[PDB]
Write a protein that binds this ligand. Structure first.
Ligand SMILES: [Zn+2]
Lengths: 98, 112, 172, 65, 134, 234, 171
RNA sequence: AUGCGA
């Protein structure tokens, strides 16, 4: 109905979170070539890239909780800075066209 | 296939000296050896002089205490080593020109 | 600076972070994290290293990314092969978990840096000094607790649970 | 001693003044008195090269397959 | 000079039989430099597994050792005089050391073989079947 | 756009409509044919042997194969001759002059070229070129003791990326994006209308468009920049 | 852009940040801070200041067995020869110390009491790698050479630079 | 400003 939510949320509870991304791309990797202590250098597993197969209904493995924390934070960061760069967007031309 | 040990020399005879890459010294340069009998162990210091410079070397006691150097001479035909305990001495060379200095200041006062 | 890095695993909390300006700035320690407040027995570590085959820097006379530099608290003590880098790191961890070498405090962090194409400059940087952040993990070969810091962690394979311990990979 | 394009004082180890800035042969040491170009010279040459980094290109990638 | 009162004059040196079995480039003799932890008493040895080339493991009272052998540092087929690891040879208790040579060529020589005793350690393997219980 | 009206877009682009008759292969030829080509882009290796009793710099630049850069940049070894002998050398030799200021086989026709370039350039002494392909260009440079020391490799690096085999001013690369929901076009990453004016036989010039407001204002005038603003923001 | 940063902290936990800079000219300059104002010195001066040594000992200290780095051979020749250019008169370490004492005597507040040798040496002892402590001057020499080698390895790009903001590199 | 609600 679109009361709240999207089919994305329904899949995130009932299916999977999937691949987390940052700034437009996959999980950060250490200079050693490891994306988490638990991963051997260059682990080619999708999970090692951040693809979360676990879902909120059945939980997520800890490596995936560590990645979903990345996505949730960097989202909240962008959320807190976009509004600071949008005030100047409003005022800069609002003075002009007033 | 293992090499046998023929003889060991345990008393001071041979020494080892660290220098700059290129060290050659006069055809006659002489090396003054010194000895320390610390408690029960010996620490060694070398000192020599030449016509212009003077070379002085000493042992790194904390690496000396944790590692000990041995040198041997092997003959393949006699299969035999003459073992020699040798101190490694880190040598530096100062010259007579390296012994000149200025006043303790440049003679300044307030205004300067 | 605010980006949560994977290095923080075990040291900073992935969820304890305020929301607003401080987000990412006000980190929070893990509930199992400890901070070194002293330094110890660093004086005896050179002796054991010398026993292990580290050439003393006066004698080594070599330097480069081509060789492993063993340093203790920022006191450069020697150079060895990178292979000896790994041998020292692992045998060091064995003598760390052992109890017969009192010149070797449990809380020493064994920074091994393997040789790597355009990687971090190699070396074996040990640290025992103050302010190290330290966290326990279980060392499997001696089945006993071992203290690891964030520097050495970078190159360490720590399984998150016993069933995911990968053969020849996870050491803790 | 001469190494590469460096020439060190053989007696003292000082990187003595370049045979190019000498009128005699023996580059004399500023710490020692040794002769030099009086004694020849370390036909100073170096095979210097590019780091294989200055020149990114698809063709560099064509060197990779 | 004879500084740091903590020092003594020398009184005892030993002649080096450099040429009692030398022949110019004919005797393949060697001089070695070996590093020994202070913990071992070298003089109480009897043979030396340096011939193992690489597998120079050695076991002295159940203590495990490895003798790292290097052909570089001095026997390098690459550079002229890579070593300041100077050999200083005496003659008599009343004479000062001399720079090694094999004739009077002002020639610093090199160590044919350099060895290093490193104390080995068990570092036992992980019992995977016991640890990775699900 | 709105806040700074910056005359320097970060990614200034010019869209080029290609005639219905323009084949996809012709279009790919044009995409390669317009993109800038630096001398660096063809360079494989540069060896500088500084031997000091003039100061000798034997610079041997062993390039790729003639066919390699001929198939990446559609250029010849002769064009390499002209660029090196006229541009590259002149700029490198001038940069060497700048560094000094900071301090203070072999045929007759080839011999005539080498002598002529010496006659055109004050520092150069020899010239050996791989005339069989262009695989390398070696030239000996001799300098007085008074020249002291420079990092010639670094000088070379800087000069390689400042020499162009082919450069359309301000224009870097022409790409072949997939045509979609509209005419086939090629999007270049640079803006130079005047140069496409020569390409009229492939581009209905009346249909060139760009993200660069200022360039439109200078060329196509105030109303076109106006329409570009409303389109770009849209 | 390249540079090395070591944060030397004395036993008492007081800190002193020391930076090495690679100039485009091959010159390396050392940054430090005194009376919380910053001061720059050529590194070859602090080297000749730590221990009496030969030029071959410093050269051997940096490149060593690495005799094949034409890149490093030439940059390091620029460094040492360049020092020989600037200071032909600093012939021995003591004189160098006199130069440092003379140039910092106004600010190290040691005057009417200390000689330029004392002021200079006290500066070394109070600034350069204080984590190594007093009389670590051969050891401080070795460490400073290690930083020069790491700096040139960074310059070539044979090693990555680290991230100050990684928890990995922090206390 | 430190921290914080939104
Ligand atoms: Zn000299």
């Amino acid at each position: 109905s679109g009361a709240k939510g999207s089919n994305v949320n329904v899949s995130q509870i009932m299916c999977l979170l999937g691949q987390q991304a940052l700034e437009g791309r996959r999980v950060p990797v250490m200079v050693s070539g490891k994306t988490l202590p638990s991963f051997k250098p260059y682990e080619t597993d999708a999970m090692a890239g951040g693809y979360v197969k676990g879902r909120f209904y059945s939980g997520i493995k800890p490596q995936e909780y560590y990645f979903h924390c990345m996505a949730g934070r960097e989202g909240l960061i962008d959320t807190a800075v976009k509004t600071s760069r949008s005030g100047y967007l409003q005022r800069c031309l609002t003075k002009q066209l007033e | 296939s293992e090499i046998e040990i023929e003889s060991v020399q345990d008393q001071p005879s041979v020494a080892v000296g660290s220098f700059f890459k290129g060290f050659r010294a006069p055809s006659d340069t002489t090396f003054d050896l010194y000895k320390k009998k610390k408690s029960e162990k010996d620490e060694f210091v070398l000192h020599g002089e030449n016509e212009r410079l003077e070379y002085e070397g000493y042992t790194d006691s904390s690496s000396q205490a944790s590692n000990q150097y041995v040198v041997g001479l092997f003959n393949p035909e006699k299969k035999s080593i003459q073992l020699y305990k040798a101190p490694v001495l880190v040598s530096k060379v100062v010259s007579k020109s390296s012994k000149n200095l200025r006043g303790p200041k440049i003679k300044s006062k307030s205004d300067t | 600076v605010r980006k949560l890095l994977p290095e923080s695993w075990g040291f900073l909390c992935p969820v304890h972070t305020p929301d607003g300006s401080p987000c990412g700035l006000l980190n929070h320690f893990a509930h199992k994290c400890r901070i070194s407040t002293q330094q110890s027995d660093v004086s005896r570590i050179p002796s054991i290293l010398y026993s292990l085959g580290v050439a003393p820097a006066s004698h080594t006379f070599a330097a480069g990314p081509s060789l492993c530099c063993v340093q203790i608290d920022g006191k450069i003590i020697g150079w060895v092969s990178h292979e000896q880098g790994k041998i020292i790191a692992d045998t060091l961890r064995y003598w760390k978990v052992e109890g017969k070498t009192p010149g070797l405090p449990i809380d020493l962090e064994i920074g091994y840096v393997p040789p790597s194409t355009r990687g971090q400059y190699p070396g074996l940087y040990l640290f025992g000094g103050h302010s190290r952040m330290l966290r326990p993990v279980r060392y499997l070969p001696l089945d006993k607790e071992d203290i690891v810091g964030p520097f050495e962690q970078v190159y360490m394979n720590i399984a998150v649970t016993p069933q995911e311990i990968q053969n020849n990979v996870h050491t803790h | 001693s001469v190494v590469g394009s460096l020439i060190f004082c053989l007696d003292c180890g000082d990187l003595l003044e370049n045979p190019n800035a000498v009128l005699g042969s023996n580059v004399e040491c500023s710490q020692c008195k040794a002769i030099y170009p009086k004694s020849q010279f370390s036909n100073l040459k170096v095979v210097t090269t590019t780091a294989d980094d200055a020149f990114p290109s698809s063709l560099r990638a064509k060197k990779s397959v | 000079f004879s500084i740091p009162d903590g020092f003594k004059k020398c009184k005892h040196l030993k002649n080096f039989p450099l040429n009692g079995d030398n022949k110019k480039k004919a005797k393949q003799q060697q001089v070695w430099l070996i590093k020994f932890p202070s913990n071992v008493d070298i003089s109480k040895l009897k043979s030396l597994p340096v011939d193992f080339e690489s597998s120079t493991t050695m076991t002295i009272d159940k203590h495990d050792y490895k003798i790292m052998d290097d052909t570089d540092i001095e026997s390098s087929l690459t550079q002229d005089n890579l070593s300041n690891m100077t050999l200083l040879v005496p003659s008599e208790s009343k004479e000062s050391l001399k720079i090694a040579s094999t004739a009077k060529d002002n020639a610093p020589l090199q160590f044919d073989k350099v060895f290093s005793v490193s104390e080995t350690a068990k570092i036992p393997a992980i019992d995977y079947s016991k640890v990775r219980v699900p | 756009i709105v806040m700074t009206a910056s005359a320097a877009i970060k990614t200034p682009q010019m869209t080029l409509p290609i005639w219905n008759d323009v084949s996809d292969e012709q279009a790919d030829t044009f995409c390669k044919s317009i993109s800038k080509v630096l001398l660096s882009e063809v360079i494989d290796k540069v060896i500088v042997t500084e031997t000091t009793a003039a100061r000798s710099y034997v610079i041997h630049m062993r390039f790729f194969d003639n066919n390699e850069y001929s198939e990446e940049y559609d250029v010849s070894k002769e064009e390499l001759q002209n660029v090196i002998s006229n541009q590259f050398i002149h700029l490198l030799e001038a940069a060497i002059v700048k560094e000094i200021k900071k301090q203070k086989n072999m045929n007759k026709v080839q011999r005539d070229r080498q002598s002529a370039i010496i006659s055109h350039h004050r520092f150069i002494t020899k010239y050996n070129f791989d005339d069989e392909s262009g695989k390398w260009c070696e030239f000996k440079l001799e300098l007085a003791a008074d020249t002291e020391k420079l990092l010639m490799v670094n000088i070379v690096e800087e000069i390689c990326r400042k020499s162009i085999i082919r450069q359309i001013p301000h224009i870097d690369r022409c790409v072949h994006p997939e045509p979609e929901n509209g005419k086939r076009v090629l999007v270049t990453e640079g803006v130079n209308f005047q140069a496409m004016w020569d390409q009229e036989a492939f581009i209905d010039v009346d249909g060139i468009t760009s993200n660069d407001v200022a360039a439109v204002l200078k060329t196509y005038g105030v109303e076109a920049a106006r329409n570009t603003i409303v389109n770009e923001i849209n | 852009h390249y540079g090395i940063q070591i944060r030397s902290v004395r036993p008492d936990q007081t800190s002193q940040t020391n930076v090495l800079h690679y100039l485009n000219d091959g010159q390396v300059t050392f940054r430090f801070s005194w009376r919380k104002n910053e001061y720059l010195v050529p590194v070859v001066m602090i080297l000749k200041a730590l221990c009496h040594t030969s030029d071959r000992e410093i050269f051997d200290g940096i490149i060593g067995n690495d005799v094949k780095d034409s890149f490093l051979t030439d940059r390091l020749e620029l460094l040492l020869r360049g020092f020989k250019k600037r200071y032909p008169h600093l012939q021995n370490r003591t004189q160098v110390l006199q130069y440092l004492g003379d140039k910092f005597r106004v600010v190290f507040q040691a005057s009417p009491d200390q000689s330029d040798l004392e002021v200079g040496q006290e500066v070394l002892d109070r600034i350069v790698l204080v984590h190594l402590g007093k009389d670590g001057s051969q050891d401080k020499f070795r460490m400073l050479l290690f930083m020069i080698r790491k700096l040139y390895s960074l310059v070539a790009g044979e090693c990555s630079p680290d991230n100050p903001d990684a928890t990995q590199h922090q206390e």
